[PDB]
Amino acid sequence: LPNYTNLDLFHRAVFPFMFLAQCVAIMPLVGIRESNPRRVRFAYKSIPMFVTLIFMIATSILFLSMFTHLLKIGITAKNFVGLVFFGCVLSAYVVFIRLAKKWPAVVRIWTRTEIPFTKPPYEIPKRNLSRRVQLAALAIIGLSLGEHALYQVSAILSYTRRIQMCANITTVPSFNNYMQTNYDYVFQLLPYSPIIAVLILLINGACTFVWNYMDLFIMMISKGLSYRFEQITTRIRKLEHEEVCESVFIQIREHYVKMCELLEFVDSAMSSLILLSCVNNLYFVCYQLLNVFNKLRWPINYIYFWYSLLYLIGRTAFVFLTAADINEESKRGLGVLRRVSSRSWCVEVERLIFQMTTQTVALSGKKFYFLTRRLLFGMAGTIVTYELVLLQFDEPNRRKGLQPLCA
Amino acid sequence: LPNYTNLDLFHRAVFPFMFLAQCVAIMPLVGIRESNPRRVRFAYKSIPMFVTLIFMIATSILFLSMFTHLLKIGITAKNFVGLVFFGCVLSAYVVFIRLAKKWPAVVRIWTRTEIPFTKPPYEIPKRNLSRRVQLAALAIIGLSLGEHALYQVSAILSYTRRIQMCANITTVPSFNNYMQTNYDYVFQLLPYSPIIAVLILLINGACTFVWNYMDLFIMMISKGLSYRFEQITTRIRKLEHEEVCESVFIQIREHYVKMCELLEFVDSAMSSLILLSCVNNLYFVCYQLLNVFNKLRWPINYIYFWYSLLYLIGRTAFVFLTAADINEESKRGLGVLRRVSSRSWCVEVERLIFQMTTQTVALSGKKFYFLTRRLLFGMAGTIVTYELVLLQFDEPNRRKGLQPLCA
Amino acid sequence: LPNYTNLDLFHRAVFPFMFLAQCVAIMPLVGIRESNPRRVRFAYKSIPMFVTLIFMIATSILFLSMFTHLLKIGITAKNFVGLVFFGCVLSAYVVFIRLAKKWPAVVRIWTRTEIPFTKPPYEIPKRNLSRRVQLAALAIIGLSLGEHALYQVSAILSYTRRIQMCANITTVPSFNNYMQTNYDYVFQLLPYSPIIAVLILLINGACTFVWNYMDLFIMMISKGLSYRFEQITTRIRKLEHEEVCESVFIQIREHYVKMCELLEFVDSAMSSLILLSCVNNLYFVCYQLLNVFNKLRWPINYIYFWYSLLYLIGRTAFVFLTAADINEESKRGLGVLRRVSSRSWCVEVERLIFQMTTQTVALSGKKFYFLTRRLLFGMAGTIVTYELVLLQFDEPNRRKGLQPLCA
Amino acid sequence: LPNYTNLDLFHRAVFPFMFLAQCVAIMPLVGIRESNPRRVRFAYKSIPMFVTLIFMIATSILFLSMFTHLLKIGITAKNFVGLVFFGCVLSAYVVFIRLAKKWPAVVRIWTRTEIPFTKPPYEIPKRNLSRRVQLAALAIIGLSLGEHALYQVSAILSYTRRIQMCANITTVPSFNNYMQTNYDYVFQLLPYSPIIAVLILLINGACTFVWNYMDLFIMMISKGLSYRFEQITTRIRKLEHEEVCESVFIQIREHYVKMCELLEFVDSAMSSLILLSCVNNLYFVCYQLLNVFNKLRWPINYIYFWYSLLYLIGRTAFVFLTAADINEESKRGLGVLRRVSSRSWCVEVERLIFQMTTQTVALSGKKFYFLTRRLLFGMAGTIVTYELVLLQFDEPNRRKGLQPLCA
């Protein structure tokens, strides 16, 4: 068997972050940290699944807390965002549980499919798969932490500043009052307690991580797939000015076909996650873009909103762009195959060129759409159209302005 | 001749539900229950056509009843839905009469085209065609009955509750008063009578069945077509790791071409029904989605509206998804044909791959659009755009709220 | 030389209606009635060009009259329709002058290209080209005459009824007063005179004829091209169950390529006309659809408005559908070519199938769009979106209602 | 080495205008005027880069001047255009600096790629590359000068006329007062001085040139690329009725492939410039189209607005049309290759036809969209949709009308 310890494989590149996601109980797999991917299994009776049940239960408590709170105070387009957030996180937990069920099969086919690319004539690029996944994961994790850190600073400063500069109701600032104030939707159903207070803080942070891991997981998966397609393209580039034997083209076509089979298998497994992530990002991007003209009290509120908005747009763009790289990388070998000399031309090149030319090699949201650069352009155009129409809806609330600080 | 009694054919799978539709006189064919499809004929002078005339006449009476009533009370965007419903049902009767005229030719070509798939190397799947059609038909029929049952319960409870809790005009509840109240558009033109009262109830239920059978018929037809394409794909999957003789690929291509010819014949026959169903579903989905924010008096009204809305959206989605399965199943054999070894490669595979790759094998609305997964995504995007623009129109009536119960 | 007298050619099919258009000086060609198309020439110094100059001068007089009138009374979205109409008629005159300049070459290439289809193995269909063109042209001309007659009847009845039922300002009805009232935009610049009155009536009729003849000419050209494409399709259908020699396929491919070259030439010649017709039809359809909910005084006004709207929508739809018939007929031979046996298969069939599959054989608006059924569906969707957005603009004037009769 | 002095090369055609752009420090390249393109180099320590720093610094001063001014007086959808203009110009400077970095590589591959087309069997067209670039450049430069000349005349006349016909505040007209009045956003931050006054005038003119050179540069680049594709098409047209040796098709395919490689290299280098130009043009076209119904005081204001609007729309259209000519010219050789006789048919023609047919040979905005005629149609449709929705936003300000002259 191959030595999985040091090979540049996808499983080695993502397991550190898959295990990290298991800390918040995202995808409950057993033995995800094993060097051999064949040891990865899904078991309902396991510690990872138990933690997932705890997080799903507690997340449902927050969802019910928000649901009951909104009913008491009425449901408006601005309060509905909170309910959608918890609903999306709960859907993510379910989607990732199903993805956990299919992962052992996916990782097994992925490993045996990518073994040929770990040996010549394929060469490891300047930035290996582990480094590519780490940079994307750390960037998303780092930006997500800053986004949540700004959220807490913005909420805390707004709370304290309102009390301090009130010349009115004082309610001396404290951790207890802040929790009952900013998280009223929770404590309006459950009795307050410092133990519960920190639990809500941790689980809201966990919900934030889950909301961000959907996009991160798609990025790491996209990085792993476009990594091998790039290697195929690099190998083809080595044949630009040479007479190529028909055997070489047979291997290239077979490896390309195997990669396409793996993408189809991975696409089917992740079809629901892509669909959930795309709709979740579209709603929040549209929702946030509708509040760009709204007036906020403190500069920190502006900093958080624009950091949150830019990060959300950037995260959405890079999910599509990283996924679209699979499509772009597949078509990059076409330009070199078209330069094949007349003597080297054979049926295998004709077969390969036809497949690259006519096949859409990309991840898809249940085949309803394919993650390509054209789709991201279409998504941007769709968002602009929605915002132009939706901004008329928000004109009344926009002109009301910010409410009095004391009130 | 083949033994049609026990063969797994399309005619056997749909005739039980085609006959059921003939009870409400949808598609007036003679001998639809015959085991031999060659005995199915269309005759104007026949009992099925007579019943169709009766239902068409009575449905026209309801259409005129609604038309005259709206003129007396004015036509608004909310009352126009009732006129569209009866107009769509009448169009369905005409469309199905024309489809009845073409059915004998369609069922004859369908039967002789699918005979090859009833014998090896084609194998019956886990769920045969009869079971696939039954599950779809019973699900649609069962959901449609619940949708109408909720409509009657919602209407009856609203009627009785308004009278009971009025402390005002009493008009002691009775079957007679309910009929004159909720169905005023009928009795405002025809004299009331208990015999007419039940007739309106039955024919409105029949109109509901016809409105739902348009989508059901497209589903059963789509199930029958994707059934054979799936068998072709399954047969191709049996050749993944084998050296295939050129004769095998000749048969596969010929059977695939014959299936494509049948789809073209079926698509032309059903082009009007698909077009009518799509426009009918689009209007009602858009109309109902415009009333999600409206306030209803009783919880039963909310239950009916959301059951009606979700069922309508689900029915529309599954019509497109079931029809799109023909397109998806055609492209599923491409992945296996691309794995054909270099020795097994021949002109027949090249011909077949080119046809699968470049031909759009799907049902179409008069070729204006093709029922694919991309179209359903486009339909959803179009509906969202219309609702965002149309919700501005409905804002005034939305803020008026529900009227006083007694008034 | 071939006997042009009795051959089933496009020039024989269209020259009667081209001469009828010349009677209103649309396309000023010399010898359009000649049996030999080679005798058709474009000359600036000719009677047709003189009549075209006269009609253009008078149409410009009407356009300036409307422009000055609107400037005096202000320009509104409702008043701009007449200025757009006159500008479109003038643009049609210019475009048809250019098309006349290009027409000798177009007709010569068309004649030398369609000669092969006048002899076996091609057969004249049930409805020959002359009959198809006659049916289309007579339908369009009769509908346009009915539309203009309804317009005149509606205007005259409105005027006379306003005068008679006024119990107020009388201005006893007369031809002079009617002309000065309904055509004030003309006589507000030129002195009134009965000669000028009848001239204005005749020239407005001519403008209507030109506006309809743009679409009529597009229809006749589309019929002429789809005729030969259908002949090719029928010849291919004649080979469904036969072993075909390579020479037959060579001839079929050569004829198809010649037809495609002719289509490219005709599209280059008529791109400006197609673009102008499409934009004019889109604008007028949107404008008329924006007035469906408006309230008109007399039933004759409703009859005229709805006849005009339905005729305009049907004319646009039939222009698009007749043009897309070329694409449909080009693609219809693919189904039969795909059934070619393995023994009859050769390089020529592969070339022909590739051309039919990958080439878009259709008329285009300067290549910005191609007249296909997908394009008609997209046009319908775009019109729906534009109407949904614009009905908000017209809500105020819609709720203002009809003005007092006497006022 | 080839004699670059008199050869009809791209570098010779554009360097006169690239050098002119360097006067306003657009693309800081060293030795752009050298006959040999290999002498063109990019150096940060050079005079062209120094001038770019000066213009970038001063443009940033104007951007800050506008930014601070808007904050003092509030940011509105009408005031934001000025900030976008300076932001786009600054982005253009950065984009062109990066393009300057890549230009030496681009011009080197471009020169060696186009050498084959300077010798038979390729012939220089009626209008050589230098003439084609000159006509486009002079037209854009000439129209841009008129657009700015009208802007200054419109601003000066409005300023003087307001003072002269005021019967109120006089502030006798002078150069000093005009600068402090129309350019208050600058002098509200910097002290006024006649030296600064002219500097602002020159740099605003330079900013206008930079805003127009983005489109001009794309045009000249598009002209250079479609020039060689047209030569390939012309060479193929020379083989319409001849028996062609396989060697000829090898050369044609190799030259076509080399041209496609050059387009890919050029497209990647100019991907950011195309993206910036498209978004900049879309915003300004949409912004200006929103003010067509606004009322301006003097006719000169109307002349400037409509000259500015028509030029902006025309410039945007011709950028897309000139770029789309690369796509159109690539597909023009297909029609002749399809006429290749059966004896001349070979694998090379099949390879070439497949590439022309299936490859999208066009410039792209980072592959998000391709500059084709379909895209320009889509752009026009998108603009119409935005304007219809956005015109509702601008209705309030539209009905306010022009403010009092004295006020």
Ligand SMILES: OC[C@H]1O[C@@](CO)(O[C@H]2O[C@H](CO)[C@@H](O)[C@H](O)[C@H]2O)[C@@H](O)[C@@H]1O
């Ligand atoms: O469901 C509302 C709930 O979300 C919280 C949880 O901490 O904030 C998260 O969700 C927001 C979007 O709804 C994000 O903007 C934010 O970054 C994220 O932390 C709370 O704001 C709220 O209680």
Ligand SMILES: OC[C@H]1O[C@@](CO)(O[C@H]2O[C@H](CO)[C@@H](O)[C@H](O)[C@H]2O)[C@@H](O)[C@@H]1O
């Ligand atoms: O035409 C209005 C008419 O439709 C009825 C007939 O029973 O209800 C049917 O049509 C509704 C949509 O218009 C559906 O929501 C409903 O499920 C269906 O039964 C009556 O409501 C009405 O008289």
Ligand SMILES: OC[C@H]1O[C@@](CO)(O[C@H]2O[C@H](CO)[C@@H](O)[C@H](O)[C@H]2O)[C@@H](O)[C@@H]1O
């Ligand atoms: O330009 C306005 C002018 O058009 C007239 C001329 O008879 O009517 C023609 O144009 C209308 C659309 O603007 C059509 O509806 C009508 O069918 C056609 O006759 C007059 O209405 C008007 O003076």
Ligand SMILES: OC[C@H]1O[C@@](CO)(O[C@H]2O[C@H](CO)[C@@H](O)[C@H](O)[C@H]2O)[C@@H](O)[C@@H]1O
């Ligand atoms: O940034 C606003 C600034 O642009 C100026 C600079 O002269 O005018 C240029 O920009 C306008 C669009 O914003 C163009 O219409 C105009 O043609 C161009 O000269 C000034 O108007 C203004 O100070």
